[PDB]
Amino acid sequence: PWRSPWAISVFAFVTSLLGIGLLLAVIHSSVTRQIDPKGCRMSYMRPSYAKLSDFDTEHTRLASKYSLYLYREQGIDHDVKVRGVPVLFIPGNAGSYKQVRPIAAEAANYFHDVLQHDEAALRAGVRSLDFFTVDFNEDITAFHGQTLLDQAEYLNEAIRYILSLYLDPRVSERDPDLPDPTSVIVLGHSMGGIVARTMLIMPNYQHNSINTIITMSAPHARPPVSFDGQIVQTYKDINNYWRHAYSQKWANDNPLWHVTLVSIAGGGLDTVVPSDYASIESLVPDTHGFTVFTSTIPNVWTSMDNQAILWCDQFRKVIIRALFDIVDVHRASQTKPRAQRMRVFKKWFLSGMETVAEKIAPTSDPTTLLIVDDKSDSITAEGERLVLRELGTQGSVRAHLMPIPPPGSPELKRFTLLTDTKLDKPGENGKLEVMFCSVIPSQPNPTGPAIPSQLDLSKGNAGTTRLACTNVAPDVITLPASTRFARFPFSVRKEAEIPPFSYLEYVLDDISEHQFVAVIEKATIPTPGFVIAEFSDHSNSHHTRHIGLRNLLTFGISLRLPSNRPMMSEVRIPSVKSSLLAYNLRISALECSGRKDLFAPLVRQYLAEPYESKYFVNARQAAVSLHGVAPYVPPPMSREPEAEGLAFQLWTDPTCNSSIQVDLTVDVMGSLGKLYMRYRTVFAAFPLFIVSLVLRKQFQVYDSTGSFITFAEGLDLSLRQSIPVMLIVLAALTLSTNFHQNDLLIGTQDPFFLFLIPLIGIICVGVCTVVNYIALSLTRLISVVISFIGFLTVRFGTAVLLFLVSTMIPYQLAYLVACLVQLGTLVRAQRISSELRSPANSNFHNYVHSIFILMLWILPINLPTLVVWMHNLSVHWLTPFTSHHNVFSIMPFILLVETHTTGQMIPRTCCVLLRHITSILLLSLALYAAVYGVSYAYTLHQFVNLFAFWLVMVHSTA
Amino acid sequence: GTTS
Ligand SMILES: *NCCOP(=O)(O)OC[C@H]1O[C@H](O[C@@H]2[C@@H](OC[C@H]3O[C@H](O[C@H]4[C@H](O)[C@@H](N)[C@@H](O[C@@H]5[C@@H](O)[C@H](O)[C@@H](O)[C@@H](O)[C@H]5OP(=O)(O)OC[C@@H](COCCCCCCCCCCCCCCCCCC)OC(=O)CCCCCCCCCCCCCCCCC)O[C@@H]4CO)[C@@H](OP(=O)(O)OCCN)[C@@H](O)[C@@H]3O)O[C@H](CO)[C@@H](O)[C@@H]2O)[C@@H](O[C@H]2O[C@H](CO)[C@@H](O)[C@H](O)[C@@H]2O)[C@@H](O)[C@@H]1O
Ligand SMILES: CC(C)CCC[C@@H](C)[C@H]1CC[C@H]2[C@@H]3CC=C4C[C@@H](O)CC[C@]4(C)[C@H]3CC[C@]12C
Ligand SMILES: CCCCCCCCCCCCCCCC(=O)O
Numbered sequence: 015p016w017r018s019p020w021a022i023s024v025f026a027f028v029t030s031l032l033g034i035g036l037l038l039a040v041i042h043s044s045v046t047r048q049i050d051p052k053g054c055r056m057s058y059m060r061p062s063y064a065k066l067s068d069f070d071t072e073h074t075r076l077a078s079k080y081s082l083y084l085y086r087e088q089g090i091d092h093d094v095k096v097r098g099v100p101v102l103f104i105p106g107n108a109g110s111y112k113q114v115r116p117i118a119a120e121a122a123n124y125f126h127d128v129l130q131h132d133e134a135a136l137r138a139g140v141r142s143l144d145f146f147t148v149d150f151n152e153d154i155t156a157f158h159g160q161t162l163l164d165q166a167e168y169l170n171e172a173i174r175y176i177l178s179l180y181l182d183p184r185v186s187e188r189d190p191d192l193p194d195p196t197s198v199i200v201l202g203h204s205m206g207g208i209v210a211r212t213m214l215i216m217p218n219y220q221h222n223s224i225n226t227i228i229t230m231s232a233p234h235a236r237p238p239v240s241f242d243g244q245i246v247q248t249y250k251d252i253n254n255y256w257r258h259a260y261s262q263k264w265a266n267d268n269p270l271w272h273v274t275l276v277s278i279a280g281g282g283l284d285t286v287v288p289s290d291y292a293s294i295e296s297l298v299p300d301t302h303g304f305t306v307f308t309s310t311i312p313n314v315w316t317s318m319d320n321q322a323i324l325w326c327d328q329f330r331k332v333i334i335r336a337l338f339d340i341v342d343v344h345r346a347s348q349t350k351p352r353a354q355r356m357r358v359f360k361k362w363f364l365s366g367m368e369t370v371a372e373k374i375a376p377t378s379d380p381t382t383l384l385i386v387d388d389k390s391d392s393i394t395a396e397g398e399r400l401v402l403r404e405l406g407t408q409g410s411v412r413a414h415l416m417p418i419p420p421p422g423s424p425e426l427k428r429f430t431l432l433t434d435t436k437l438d439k440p441g442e443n444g445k446l447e448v449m450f451c452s453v454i455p456s457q458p459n460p461t462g463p464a465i466p467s468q469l470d471l472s473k474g475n476a477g478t479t480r481l482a483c484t485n486v487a488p489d490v491i492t493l494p495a496s497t498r499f500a501r502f503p504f505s506v507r508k509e510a511e512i513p514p515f516s517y518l519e520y521v522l523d524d525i526s527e528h529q530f531v532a533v534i535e536k537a538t539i540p541t542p543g544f545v546i547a548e549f550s551d552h553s554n555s556h557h558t559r560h561i562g563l564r565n566l567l568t569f570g571i572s573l574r575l576p577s578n579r580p581m582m583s584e585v586r587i588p589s590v591k592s593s594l595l596a597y598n599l600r601i602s603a604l605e606c607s608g609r610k611d612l613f614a615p616l617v618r619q620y621l622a623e624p625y626e627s628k629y630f631v632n633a634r635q636a637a638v639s640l641h642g643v644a645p646y647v648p649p650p651m652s653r654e655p656e657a658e659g660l661a662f663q664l665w666t667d668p669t670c671n672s673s674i675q676v677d678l679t680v681d682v683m684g685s686l687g688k689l690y691m692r693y694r695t696v697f698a699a700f701p702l703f704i705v706s707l708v709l710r711k712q713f714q715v716y717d718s719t720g721s722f723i724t725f726a727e728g729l730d731l732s733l734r735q736s737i738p739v740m741l742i743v744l745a746a747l748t749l750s751t752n753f754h755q756n757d758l759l760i761g762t763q764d765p766f767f768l769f770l771i772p773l774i775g776i777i778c779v780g781v782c783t784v785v786n787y788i789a790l791s792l793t794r795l796i797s798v799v800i801s802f803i804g805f806l807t808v809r810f811g812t813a814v815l816l817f818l819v820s821t822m823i824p825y826q827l828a829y830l831v832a833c834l835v836q837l838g839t840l841v842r843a844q845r846i847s848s849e850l851r852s853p854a855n856s857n858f859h860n861y862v863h864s865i866f867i868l869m870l871w872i873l874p875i876n877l878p879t880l881v882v883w884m885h886n887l888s889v890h891w892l893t894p895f896t897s898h899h900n901v902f903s904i905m906p907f908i909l910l911v912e913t914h915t916t917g918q919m920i921p922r923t924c925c926v927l928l929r930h931i932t933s934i935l936l937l938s939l940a941l942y943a944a945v946y947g948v949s950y951a952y953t954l955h956q957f958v959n960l961f962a963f964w965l966v967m968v969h970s971t972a
Numbered sequence: 973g974t975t976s
Contacts, residue, residue: 056976057973058973058974058975058976059973059974059975060973060974060975061974061975088974115975119973325976
């Protein structure tokens with residue numbers, strides 16, 4: 015019986031309805047659930063660009079296509095001359111050279127306002143930053159690999175030209191005793207950072223010409239999409255280059271020994287590049303770089319888009335300060351040595367509470383000699399926390415000396431100080447100064463003059479105890495201010511910004527060589543401000559909840575930290591590692607009894623790797639979403655069991671004497687929406703798994719009964735046996751020193767995430783049904799247009815295609831034209847089948863429609879190369895094409911489409927061997943699309959080309 | 973500024 019192409023089974027319609035339903039739920043809850051606060055302040059400037067037009071085709075062939083600019087900021091740069099450290103900004107996928115605007119303008123203003131007067135800073139080798147930016151014509155870099163290589167080659171030549179600029183007296187005004195620059199600092203955005211890494215492997219790279227790469231939201235670990243084979247190969251090249259170079263034991267054999275790479279990720283608000291791909295932990299050792307999120311950068315504390323990471327005001331200031339702390343024009347490479355650069359980057363980008371954080375004060379030179387009476391009024395008893403409700407009660411400079419406990423106790427102990435008042439730098443009279451004091455011997459022990467050491471007379475008694483004291487300002491941790499009028503760690507309005515808190519955290523072994531911690535209260539009149547300092551035991555402050563993921567997802571975890579709690583408490587859940595699961599954190603009300611608390615509770619949700627910390631000021635209700643173990647990225651490196659999973663750091667007022675409750679439960683819809691960044695690229699490949707299994711069932715029934723069933727009927731027959739079985743095979747495949755372990759299927763071998771295979775399968779069933787109905791609608795619509803033209807008329811009245819591809823037409827244009835000719839054949843087939851309604855006309859229509867669906871699901875992979883080619887034609891760039899690859903990638907489709915235009919139906923199918931070859935080919939295509947589809951989506955075109963050649967063979971046999 |  016004639017079965018309509020539009021008819022669908024109830025079983026296949028319900029399954030497709032769930033697939034579309036689960037797609038909407040994932041998409042909807044990825045834009046509404048667990049969304050981070052937006053806290054970027056817009057930045058304004060006066061932009062200007064000087065085109066370096068002497069950098070032309072004599073220097074590089076690509077200079078007819080690309081351009082180089084020097085940023086000049088109005089009010090600062092009054093001429094196009096280079097007077098400082100050269101910095102190169104690389105824009106990303108379809109980015110603009112005019113995106114350096116914010117960061118280049120802040121660098122121009124900061125040197126004008128502050129540094130150019132700081133005479134010590136210039137004497138230390140600090141000059142202005144010359145920001146060069148490159149115009150790539152908004153190239154689609156993430157979708158074409160030859161574009162990436164061209165950009166890297168152009169930029170190596172551009173660095174040669176930039177460094178040549180500093181030799182010309184007519185263009186460079188610099189001190190005559192300075193060395194000539196031999197390096198450029200590279201700041202790359204998105205694909206821009208990837209080009210920077212590629213720049214170091216290209217043949218025309220000049221050695222030692224890049225030593226500092228800072229990338230903003232760059233996918234270092236993995237290509238964003240794998241539609242081009244050259245992108246995948248270049249990622250393999252650069253990732254292998256970093257891994258091999260840093261795996262060398264002798265630094266002379268390490269080409270990247272002097273290179274530091276810092277990767278900054280926008281976070282959860284970045285929906286263009288997954289922040290999971292920014293992790294360089296599998297590429298760069300901690301001595302040479304790190305991955306940091308903008309939510310952990312002090313005085314930024316916000317997540318950002320892919321675009322806002324450049325113009326955000328807070329982050330702009332932070333990055334310019336970090337860049338100005340590394341430059342050194344006294345060295346030919348215009349930066350400090352590698353270790354000093356790493357220390358500065360850690361200071362400016364990291365929270366300071368990491369394990370890699372370095373403490374300066376404990377072993378630093380003493381900066382102040384303090385005189386205190388022997389009456390021990392200042393010296394307090396051990397085990398008492400120092401609480402200063404107000405500053406300046408007495409009206410004179412005071413010293414509070416806290417004795418450091420002896421290290422005899424086996425338990426680990428920490429000294430923690432929290433204040434909302436800015437701590438004085440050495441040699442500065444402010445409101446408050448904290449310093450580590452060591453007792454000076456009564457006997458005149460031989461020592462230096464202590465000329466930097468200043469005096470502070472506070473005794474006025476015979477004792478006059480002498481103390482040599484080191485200011486702890488170098489090691490101050492800046493914490494967002496958690497007052498009870500604060501909602502976010504940031505403030506979009508600069509006027510409403512609360513001055514942040516100051517935090518000190520020391521292990522007792524670090525400061526055991528000292529005798530006291532001196533909190534010098536310099537205020538005289540009573541001024542607002544609190545200081546809490548105490549020593550705490552690791553047992554009392556740190557809690558670990560060893561609860562499995564199943565129990566955590568079922569019941570959640572609840573803690574009741576006690577009232578005796580130290581000011582700072584940590585709660586670690588080692589089983590919270592996945593980036594795909596989102597939680598909800600609740601902190602109980604601090605019932606401060608009889609008094610208001612000194613500050614509101616502050617929570618730091620953080621991960622050991624990558625450096626991804628999030629702050630919740632006035633914490634009561636926090637959305638806990640983390641960037642942990644992501645699906646397709648290389649596996650995390652070995653770590654201590656004390657740094658695994660998720661930890662919460664809690665600061666509360668300890669004087670309230672009220673216990674606090676911490677609850678953590680799972681957010682099901684937020685967890686569901688976490689899947690969109692991670693699995694959006696599955697849908698260029700994995701729906702071919704469903705289509706190939708449907709075409710397998712259509713050909714099976716045809717070869718056995720002679721009837722080519724509709725795509726919907728084939729889908730209904732496949733959902734009963736074939737598709738469920740092959741999803742079980744995918745699950746079994748997942749369960750069965752390599753950095754490409756997580757590149758196939760779901761990318762997660764973890765058996766917990768096996769439900770993702772049925773989830774993706776059902777969503778792709780729904781998507782295939784919808785695309786089928788779209789193709790049917792398009793066929794009917796074109797047929798209606800043709801019939802309408804016919805009625806308007808009535809009432810009112812070859813073998814050359816091979817030559818085209820070999821010369822100038824890329825096979826993607828030919829493929830699009832083949833798809834259009836196939837649509838025309840489909841329209842004729844449908845019209846004929848409606849006119850005649852023969853069983854032979856239904857077979858041809860169904861067969862042509864299925865082949866059209868197969869072609870249409872490969873078209874997405876080929877379209878990105880078409881736009882690149884059209885763009886290059888617009889710019890007048892011509893790219894030669896290898897005739898062997900173009901011809902062999904398009905002839906099977908050309909021949910199939912021609913055969914269909916002749917109207918010939920596929921011959922029905924030693925004969926059983928030809929019958930089984932079609933089944934085997936379609937099964938292999940389904941399995942290959944499922945397994946290698948995400949990472950090698952460019953090979954699907956070739957595989958489907960092979961299947962089309964097989965169909966042409968079967969057509970030829972009869 | 974003059975531009976954002
Ligand atoms: N003052 C200082 C500052 O400044 P400004 O900026 O002004 O300010 C700010 C702002 O902002 C905004 O606005 C903005 C502005 O602008 C201006 C600018 O402009 C430009 O620039 C630009 C450029 O041009 C562009 N291009 C962009 O770029 C970028 C770059 O930059 C980077 O780097 C990169 O990275 C990227 O990002 C880029 O972008 P794009 O390009 O767009 O990209 C993105 C995308 C891409 O891709 C797409 C596509 C892909 C794929 C596709 C392909 C293929 C496939 C398919 C095919 C087809 C098929 C069919 C057939 C077959 C059938 C079937 C079978 O990407 C994305 O999106 C990603 C994703 C995608 C999608 C996905 C899909 C998938 C699906 C699936 C799903 C499923 C799921 C599953 C699950 C489950 C599992 C289980 O951007 C930039 C910007 O910046 C320039 O200018 P010039 O030069 O002039 O240029 C011109 C031209 N246009 C510069 O200069 C400037 O600046 O404004 C405008 C207006 O006017 C606008 O538009 C913009 O936007 C606003 O605001 C905002 O902001 C921010 C954002 O932005 C935030 O934050 C805030 O809040 C707001 O909202 C305003 O207002 C402001 O003012
Ligand atoms: C994945 C799910 C949501 C499918 C959504 C696609 C839409 C366009 C589909 C779903 C069911 C379809 C209908 C099912 C069957 C018929 C009978 C046929 O004689 C005419 C078309 C008609 C009336 C279809 C029109 C298009 C339709 C409404
Ligand atoms: C058929 C399409 C579905 C599968 C592909 C999913 C597309 C995801 C988009 C990722 C590419 C984003 C382009 C910018 C990349 C960058 O700036 O680095």
